[PDB]
Amino acid sequence: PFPSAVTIKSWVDKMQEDLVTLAKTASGVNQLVDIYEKYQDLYTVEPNNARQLVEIAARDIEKLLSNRSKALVRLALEAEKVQAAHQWREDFASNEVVYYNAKDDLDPEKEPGSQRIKPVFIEDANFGRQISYQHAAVHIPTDIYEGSTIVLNELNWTSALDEVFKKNREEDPSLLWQVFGSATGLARYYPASPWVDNKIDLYDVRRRPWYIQGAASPKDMLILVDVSGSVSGLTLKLIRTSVSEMLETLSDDDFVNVASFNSNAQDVSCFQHLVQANVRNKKVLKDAVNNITAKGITDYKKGFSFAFEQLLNYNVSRANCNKIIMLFTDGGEERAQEIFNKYNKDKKVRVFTFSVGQHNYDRGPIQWMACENKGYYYEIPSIGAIRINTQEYLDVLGRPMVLAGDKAKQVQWTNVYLDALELGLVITGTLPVFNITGQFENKTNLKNQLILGVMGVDVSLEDIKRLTPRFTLCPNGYYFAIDPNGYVLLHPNLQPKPIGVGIPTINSQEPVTLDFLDAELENDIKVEIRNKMIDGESGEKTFRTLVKSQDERYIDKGNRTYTWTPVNGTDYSLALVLPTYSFYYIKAKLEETITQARYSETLKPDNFEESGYTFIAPRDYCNDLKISDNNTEFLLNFNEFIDRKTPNNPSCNADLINRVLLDAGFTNELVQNYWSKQKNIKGVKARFVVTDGGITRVYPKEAGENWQENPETYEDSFYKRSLDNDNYVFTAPYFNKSGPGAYESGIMVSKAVEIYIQGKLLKPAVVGIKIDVNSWIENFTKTSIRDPCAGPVCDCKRNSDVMDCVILDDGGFLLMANHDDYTNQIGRFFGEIDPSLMRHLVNISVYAFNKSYDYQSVCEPCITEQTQYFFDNDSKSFSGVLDCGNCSRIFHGEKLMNTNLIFIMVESKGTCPCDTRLLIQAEQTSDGPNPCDMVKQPRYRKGPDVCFDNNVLEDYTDCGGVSG
Ligand SMILES: *[C@@H]1O[C@H](CO)[C@@H](O[C@@H]2O[C@H](CO)[C@@H](O[C@@H]3O[C@H](CO)[C@@H](O)[C@H](O)[C@H]3NC(C)=O)[C@H](O)[C@H]2NC(C)=O)[C@H](O)[C@H]1NC(C)=O
Ligand SMILES: *[C@@H]1O[C@H](CO)[C@@H](O[C@@H]2O[C@H](CO)[C@@H](O)[C@H](O)[C@H]2NC(C)=O)[C@H](O)[C@H]1NC(C)=O
Ligand SMILES: *[C@@H]1O[C@H](CO)[C@@H](O[C@@H]2O[C@H](CO)[C@@H](O)[C@H](O)[C@H]2NC(C)=O)[C@H](O)[C@H]1NC(C)=O
Ligand SMILES: *[C@@H]1O[C@H](CO)[C@@H](O[C@@H]2O[C@H](CO)[C@@H](O)[C@H](O)[C@H]2NC(C)=O)[C@H](O)[C@H]1NC(C)=O
Ligand SMILES: *[C@@H]1O[C@H](CO)[C@@H](O)[C@H](O)[C@H]1NC(C)=O
Numbered sequence: 001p002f003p004s005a006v007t008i009k010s011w012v013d014k015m016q017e018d019l020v021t022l023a024k025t026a027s028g029v030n031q032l033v034d035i036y037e038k039y040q041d042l043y044t045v046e047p048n049n050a051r052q053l054v055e056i057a058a059r060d061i062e063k064l065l066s067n068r069s070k071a072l073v074r075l076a077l078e079a080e081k082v083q084a085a086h087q088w089r090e091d092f093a094s095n096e097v098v099y100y101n102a103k104d105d106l107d108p109e110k111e112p113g114s115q116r117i118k119p120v121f122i123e124d125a126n127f128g129r130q131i132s133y134q135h136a137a138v139h140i141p142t143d144i145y146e147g148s149t150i151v152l153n154e155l156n157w158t159s160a161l162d163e164v165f166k167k168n169r170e171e172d173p174s175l176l177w178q179v180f181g182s183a184t185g186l187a188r189y190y191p192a193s194p195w196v197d198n199k200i201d202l203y204d205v206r207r208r209p210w211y212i213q214g215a216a217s218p219k220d221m222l223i224l225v226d227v228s229g230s231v232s233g234l235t236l237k238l239i240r241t242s243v244s245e246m247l248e249t250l251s252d253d254d255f256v257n258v259a260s261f262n263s264n265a266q267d268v269s270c271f272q273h274l275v276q277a278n279v280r281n282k283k284v285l286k287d288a289v290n291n292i293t294a295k296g297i298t299d300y301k302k303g304f305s306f307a308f309e310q311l312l313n314y315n316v317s318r319a320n321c322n323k324i325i326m327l328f329t330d331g332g333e334e335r336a337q338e339i340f341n342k343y344n345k346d347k348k349v350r351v352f353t354f355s356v357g358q359h360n361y362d363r364g365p366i367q368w369m370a371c372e373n374k375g376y377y378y379e380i381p382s383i384g385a386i387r388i389n390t391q392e393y394l395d396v397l398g399r400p401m402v403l404a405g406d407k408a409k410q411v412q413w414t415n416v417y418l419d420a421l422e423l424g425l426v427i428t429g430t431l432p433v434f435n436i437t438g439q440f441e442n443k444t445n446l447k448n449q450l451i452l453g454v455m456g457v458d459v460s461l462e463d464i465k466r467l468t469p470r471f472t473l474c475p476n477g478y479y480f481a482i483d484p485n486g487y488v489l490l491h492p493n494l495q496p497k498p499i500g501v502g503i504p505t506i507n508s509q510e511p512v513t514l515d516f517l518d519a520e521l522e523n524d525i526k527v528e529i530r531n532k533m534i535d536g537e538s539g540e541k542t543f544r545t546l547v548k549s550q551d552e553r554y555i556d557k558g559n560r561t562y563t564w565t566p567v568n569g570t571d572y573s574l575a576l577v578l579p580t581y582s583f584y585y586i587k588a589k590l591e592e593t594i595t596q597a598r599y600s601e602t603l604k605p606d607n608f609e610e611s612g613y614t615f616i617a618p619r620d621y622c623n624d625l626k627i628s629d630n631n632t633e634f635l636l637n638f639n640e641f642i643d644r645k646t647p648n649n650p651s652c653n654a655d656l657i658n659r660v661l662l663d664a665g666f667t668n669e670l671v672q673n674y675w676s677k678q679k680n681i682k683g684v685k686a687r688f689v690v691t692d693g694g695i696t697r698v699y700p701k702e703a704g705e706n707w708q709e710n711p712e713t714y715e716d717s718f719y720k721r722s723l724d725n726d727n728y729v730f731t732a733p734y735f736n737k738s739g740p741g742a743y744e745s746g747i748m749v750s751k752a753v754e755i756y757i758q759g760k761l762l763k764p765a766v767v768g769i770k771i772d773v774n775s776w777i778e779n780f781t782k783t784s785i786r787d788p789c790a791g792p793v794c795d796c797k798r799n800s801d802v803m804d805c806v807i808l809d810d811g812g813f814l815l816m817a818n819h820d821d822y823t824n825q826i827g828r829f830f831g832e833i834d835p836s837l838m839r840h841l842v843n844i845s846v847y848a849f850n851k852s853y854d855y856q857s858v859c860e861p862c863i864t865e866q867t868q869y870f871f872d873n874d875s876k877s878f879s880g881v882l883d884c885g886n887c888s889r890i891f892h893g894e895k896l897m898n899t900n901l902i903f904i905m906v907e908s909k910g911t912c913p914c915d916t917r918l919l920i921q922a923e924q925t926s927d928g929p930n931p932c933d934m935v936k937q938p939r940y941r942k943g944p945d946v947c948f949d950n951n952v953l954e955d956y957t958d959c960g961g962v963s964g
């Protein structure tokens, strides 16, 4: 029969007592506590003033960005002057311009006016590529010829930029790239490196996001696509491709909507008013455009009366400047003067008309439409012209800002994106270069209304991470930065991968934009904090929050303090996250050389046998010291650097080395004093200790090989979980993996060491014990059953036909069970085993499911969706019958004290046959939030407030029709 409540309570208490006493008397929690207090005077406890740390880091970031901006300013000034001094030569001798071309074979062994350079590249670990500091490299795309009179002249006058490149690199030796995009297509970057290796190069500097950002202002684009009968065939395909390519030239500050009209206008997609050009809204628009079919009779007066009306909707968020209309058609007869005179008579909306396809229609009304209203006229007769014709409109948009003068020259930083030359995540500062030919004397201003190009300097996210040190903080603490759009400049979750836009269809260029709410669990307080950081305010917030574990299988509850201050002079805002225990940290004392030598003796490779297999985190301690992926090489390197020259050396971080050696001494003292006394423990497979300061030691040698955790202590998930929890934490092993299962490695349970210096609280180290599966299962079996209770089993035997005994963790994964096949399935989620039982537990509020979306994830032909189950009711007791289909199974669940395990004893599914749709806990490729519903309630984003959208001097006489 079903055991009584007092009997099962006693049974759970016995199992608890056994496990907790084994863990406490095997891993020396009190032992390390006593060691830490009684080895005082070798360290001091220093405060962590968040208001000071975040301000210092913000000031450092501001200084770095000002350094990066001064180079742009001086480069732009020099380029403007050199263009002002240039003479337009036409007769170029075969050797008059000298450059590298950055795309020629280095060994040709062999032009109209150019002489190539054979440069020398040695190496540079700062870039990873092979670079030359002697001269700059020029990239000319495949389409544009390098012998044209328009390209040779720039190849000549831009040659003066190399001196300023060298001057900037010698003033600030940390400059990565210094690129000068040109209006003709060529790009000049200072460190001479070969271009990226069918290998055809489609790169065009005039389409990169930084160039587009620096060449114009945020736009309000409304593409108007003609879908009448006449555009059927090749014209429709060209229109679709051209619209997609035009959508590709849009940033997050830009708002766009695509409409269509044969005889009555309609929105092409679910959007109705306007959407910002994210990576997802753009995909929605592209798919809706690719679904377009052509049928009907053209009606311009009903399409423009629709475009102008959606350009007047102010209930929604928009860039509120540069209201432009794109007309994609073939040709017609109606110019529709009445519509323009009615809607746009003061001429505040630009109109760009495109004549797509190969035909013989009247290209007359559309040229007049692009002429009367501000705009330019384009013709796309083939796929080749699509790129240039779609990218050219920025030249037209750039006139107001150049006419503004030396007021639009403001440095703007792009979103995080993967570098073209493979440096990883970078951000580029952009400064436009104006045309000042004949500036001193008021003679020429007709062609001075077009930009020469955009200057750009790249700063890597590694620099910004280096400006924010994290090793004085607890692993749970971290830094993050937010831009006005809400995306993260810095975040631990952010990874160098393109953002998943949707489910991968069967059979790097895009910016990496990850929102703050999409990098952590969304919470009500975290939205207010995000809004405050966007507004640019400084404040403190302490609140209870749910934090996802690093392994992403668990959710644990902790106290966190958010401190944020704006990076003044820059749109970005910086914030610091600190748990309560992280407010105080241990700083190692200088001590003496004898102590350093004694501590260095501990972790030598020959000393593994006594100390245990030692892991050292790959943290850079010296500039010459090189971190390695394999921990053995790094440990050998650290040993030889410490022993060979000095424990403390110039150009090395004294604090980090002192902390590491102090931790090594503490760990060796622990092991030799306590662990060595008990050579073998029946319940314990292995004893390991993980300590802040990047050292990990496990006593058994076989366990060291079995140990699969990250060498870095901060990256360990179990370490962070033990920090968050004040009780013993059990970590479920991985199931059906290449790594050894929980039969040779055991079950990992970890308890955090708590230190009380003065009244302060410190949690420097975490200890763990690996539990033998065999000892655990036999102990679980013997205590559960009562020998004289009854003939039929009152509790589970080794293989109970009826009664089922399984103990679960907070995540719900199975750690121990009576059944043999269940024990073969240790480490698996308890779903796929008794899914109806899990659904009942969730329904009665035993576990709480919280789902999220990972956007930077890779699948097999993407956004995935993850689920993470946690305990949510702190009631130690739950019972009930399952009320199964036509039946009912009785269960009782008791949680095992501190250890956090939960034992549930229920009947087998033979008794009451329920349905088994599994409750899966993995990540399943799932498309993310519907964009259509998310645009109705947008998030809060601050927007640039500097727009140059009109000047009255602007000469709109270059409309294009006349010049063709
Ligand atoms: C655009 O191309 C032109 C051709 O290379 C360059 O103009 C030439 O610059 C040369 C620099 O070596 C000048 O040579 C020197 O000029 C001085 C006058 O200061 C004279 O004594 C000599 O002609 C000569 N001597 C020296 C000191 O080497 C050429 O006079 C000059 N003229 C030509 C041939 O066009 C420009 O440099 C280039 N533009 C930019 C901005 O780089
Ligand atoms: C950035 O500079 C601003 C200047 O506006 C600083 O803000 C000032 O802070 C000082 C003392 O902290 C006060 O005397 C001023 O009244 C503040 N001005 C305000 C309210 O804007 C700010 O300290 C700097 N921020 C950083 C990151 O150091
Ligand atoms: C939203 O925009 C629409 C048009 O874009 C406008 O509709 C008005 O709605 C209010 C109340 O909802 C009513 O007075 C009328 O239906 C509309 N006003 C007019 C045309 O007189 C309005 O600008 C916005 N609606 C709201 C919610 O204010
Ligand atoms: C994720 O977990 C949190 C904490 O359990 C959820 O918040 C609770 O939701 C339940 C109902 O699901 C309410 O009864 C509680 O009052 C909520 N607590 C708080 C503090 O709001 C949260 O709703 C879960 N879901 C997601 C996906 O966010
Ligand atoms: C700014 O550059 C100066 C030299 O130009 C340098 O001393 C300083 O460290 C730089 N600031 C940074 C990189 O934060």
Ligand SMILES: [Ca+2]
Pocket: 228, 229, 230, 231, 297, 298
């Ligand atoms: Ca037609």
